[PDB]
């Protein structure tokens, strides 16, 4: 019966390809060929942070745009006060292999995950004055790539088992599981409304998932190699993807096909992290050329290069109020950049 | 000045945290790290117990050095996408089963186990990250091969092989065949050693290899290289 099933699947693929052909009318450049260019963008390091002794892999801003959390391979989770460069907490870890970290919106819990295939939850505000483990979620078969909190009692995770999962923390049991990826997924960015969330995998495919019904809704393709990073537009109707080749892409949601690509001749290496500014005009990316780049989203032209790291830029983040940009590389350093007037 | 009392207290807290981090790094610096790889057929679960989840960690102390052995073979994912986390290790221990040339893989029966080990070694030796990391080769199941080579020649997997069917000639031929796969024979040193029942001697071999690599690293640090 495989023959007929394959033939009808191919027919449906042709049907959707024709539908996408009907959808596409004009490219983004034909519309954004008249707006004013953003001009030169120059930023410098207002403050620098030190204390790690190994490569930094993850970094997440708090909800108040003041407190920071960083994770590195020496087995430490450090919470920084970026205003005056003090350390408020230094949590030791049980496993030294981590690749993600998060900050709960309220500001009471933090989360960690790595090669150990378990998600650890830490509680900050207690009566006795030390951080403690609150939950150790387990059940995934494969390394965890990213974790993001939902409501201080729910969490969503993505792993190398080609699977995403949704958990509640009290009982510590899975509620819904998302499957449909051939290669392993390595990035997810939750929507502001916490109703839908998108994920990009290593098979050059991105997908949309509903958080309650737990089924795939839209499937996006257009890349060749693996997809390494993803981020959500502040509006909630678009998202950007970073690729293992020297390309980035922007997708809209009500139209399944892509809008614009970001590439250049001199750049050959891939993209590690991607983040958006709050106004949605600037697109920040980290590369393997030991520097970060800024793209004008509506025009796909370079407008700024942040140099100053001696190794690969691993993590990149933007505050909620959009006042500073945080960057972390493999040289055991963290940096906070902000332009001057 | 222009700072409050609570600012002073926070500054002292930060200084204490920095001191603790420095001491932790000082303690963690003097430790050797070994990464264990190889085909999952055999030879990996035996050397791990000769010394005495997705990742497994083992600690053992020998002649006043601390050894951390990392075994990751149950991860079952894309090796490229996480093999870079192990850059900076002292050495890679590769275990190769020897009495499997006659043996045939369950999948792709026309394709032999020995060729799978060969391609694994060719992929791991010439990787971009491990350009200076030494590789310690462990050829396993000597007795099984001795009782097996007496019946079948290497032509079942090595048709071009020539020479006598005795044990020593075949063992030397296989060792040379595996050592020939190295391309950058200026920085790497491949140490080969056939295993036996006694576990004390294997630890001595890994100790000597680690000592040589660490002395080379110290010479590189001082610029005398």
């Amino acid at each position, epitope marked *: 019966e495989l023959d007929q099933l394959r033939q009808e699947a191919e027919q449906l693929k042709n049907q959707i390809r024709d539908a996408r052909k009907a959808c596409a009318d004009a490219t983004l450049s034909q519309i954004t060929n008249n707006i004013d260019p953003v001009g030169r963008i120059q930023m410098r390091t207002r403050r620098t942070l030190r204390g790690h002794l190994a490569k930094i892999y993850a970094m997440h801003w708090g909800t108040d745009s*003041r*407190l920071l959390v960083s994770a590195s391979q020496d087995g430490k989770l450090i919470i920084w*006060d970026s205003y005056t460069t*003090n350390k*408020v907490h230094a949590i030791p870890l049980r496993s030294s292999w981590v690749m993600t970290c998060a900050y709960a919106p309220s500001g009471n819990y933090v989360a960690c995950g790595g090669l150990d295939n378990i998600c650890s939850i830490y509680n900050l505000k207690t*009566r*006795e*004055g*030390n951080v403690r483990v609150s939950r150790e979620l387990a059940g995934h078969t494969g390394y965890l790539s990213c974790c993001r909190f939902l409501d201080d009692n729910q969490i969503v995770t993505s792993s190398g088992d080609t699977t995403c999962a949704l958990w509640d923390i009290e009982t510590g049991q899975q509620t819904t599981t998302f499957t449909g990826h051939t290669g392993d997924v390595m990035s997810l960015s939750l929507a502001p409304d916490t109703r839908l969330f998108v994920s990009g995998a290593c098979d050059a495919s991105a997908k949309l998932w509903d958080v309650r019904e737990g089924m795939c809704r839209q499937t996006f393709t257009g890349h060749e190699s693996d997809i390494n990073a993803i981020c959500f537009f502040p509006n909630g109707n678009a998202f950007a993807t970073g690729s293992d080749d020297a390309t980035c892409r922007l997708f809209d949601l009500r139209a399944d096909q892509e809008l614009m690509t970001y590439s250049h001749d001199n750049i050959i290496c891939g993209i590690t992290s991607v983040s958006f500014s709050k106004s949605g005009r600037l697109l920040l990316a980290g590369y393997d050329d030991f520097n970060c780049n800024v793209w004008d989203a509506l025009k796909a032209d370079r407008a700024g290069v942040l140099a100053g790291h001696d190794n690969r830029v691993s993590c990149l983040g933007v505050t909620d109020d959009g006042m500073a940009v945080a960057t972390g590389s493999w040289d055991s350093f963290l940096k906070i950049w902000n332009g001057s007037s | 000045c*222009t*700072l*409050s*009392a*609570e*600012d*002073k*207290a*926070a500054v*002292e*807290r930060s200084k*204490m945290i920095d001191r603790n981090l420095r001491e932790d790094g000082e303690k963690a610096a003097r430790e050797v790290k070994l990464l264990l790889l190889g085909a999952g057929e055999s030879g990996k679960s035996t050397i791990v117990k000769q010394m005495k989840t997705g990742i497994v960690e083992t600690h053992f102390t020998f002649k006043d050095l601390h050894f951390k052995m990392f075994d990751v073979g149950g991860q079952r994912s894309e090796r490229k996408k996480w093999i870079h986390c192990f850059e900076g290790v002292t050495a890679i221990i590769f275990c190769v089963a020897l009495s499997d040339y006659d043996l045939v893989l369950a999948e792709d029966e026309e394709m032999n186990r020995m060729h799978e080990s060969m391609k694994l070694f060719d992929s791991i030796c010439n990787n971009k990250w491990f350009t200076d990391t030494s590789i310690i080769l462990f050829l396993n199941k000597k007795d099984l091969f001795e009782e097996k080579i007496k019946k079948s020649p290497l032509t079942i997997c090595y048709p071009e092989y020539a020479g006598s069917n005795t044990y020593e000639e075949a063992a030397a031929y296989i060792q040379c065949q595996f050592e020939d796969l190295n391309k950058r024979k200026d920085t790497k040193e491949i140490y080969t050693h056939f295993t036996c029942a006694t576990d004390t001697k294997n630890v001595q071999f890994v100790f000597d290899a680690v000592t040589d690599v660490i002395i080379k690293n110290n010479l590189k640090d001082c610029g005398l290289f």
Partner: single-chain antibody
Amino acid sequence: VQLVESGGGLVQPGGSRKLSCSASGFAFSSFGMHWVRQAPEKGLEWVAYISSGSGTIYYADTVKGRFTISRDDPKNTLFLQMTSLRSEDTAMYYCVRSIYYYGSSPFDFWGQGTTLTVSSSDIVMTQATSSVPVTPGESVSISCRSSKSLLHSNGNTYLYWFLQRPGQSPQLLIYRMSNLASGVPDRFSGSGSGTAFTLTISRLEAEDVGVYYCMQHLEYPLTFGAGTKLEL
């Protein structure tokens, strides 16, 4: 969390006394320690201060020289040594914890205290309300007054509120003039700007009986107000 102390009683003049604070139920090395004396029929006055790691040691002018304060972190104990006593040192003492970092709440816990009876510039806080009779269900406001401005360029105002019931230890209600602690109900509120400082209670329960205190924590001489007495 508990804090029990020992030592004291009747002492002849010219002697010496060892006072001990023994802590159990929480981490200790991350906390700084304070001592506070209580006048026989008046408000409290600050005495000493030791910080975490035994780096900074602070005293009061009236007790300098003959007072010493030390700690033993591994055994979780705190010591005060007093010499050359006199009729002034007739008070019942309290042992207080405080932790300092971004977002922390200093002066969260208080102890029971022990009695010491003996035989025969600084910013000033004034509360001139003395005593006021109120009935349950009637909203109440309490005023505290300073001399110098209590606002620093870091955007923080250092005023603390305390409430003392008859037969109990003080409890913290408001820190940094505007924030509630843990265990306090919602009906307590606080506000004010510059010098005049206001505390408001909307609903009154039977348990809301006693003396209210305002405290400053800007300059290290820590002075208490006269206090507000509330009764039915």
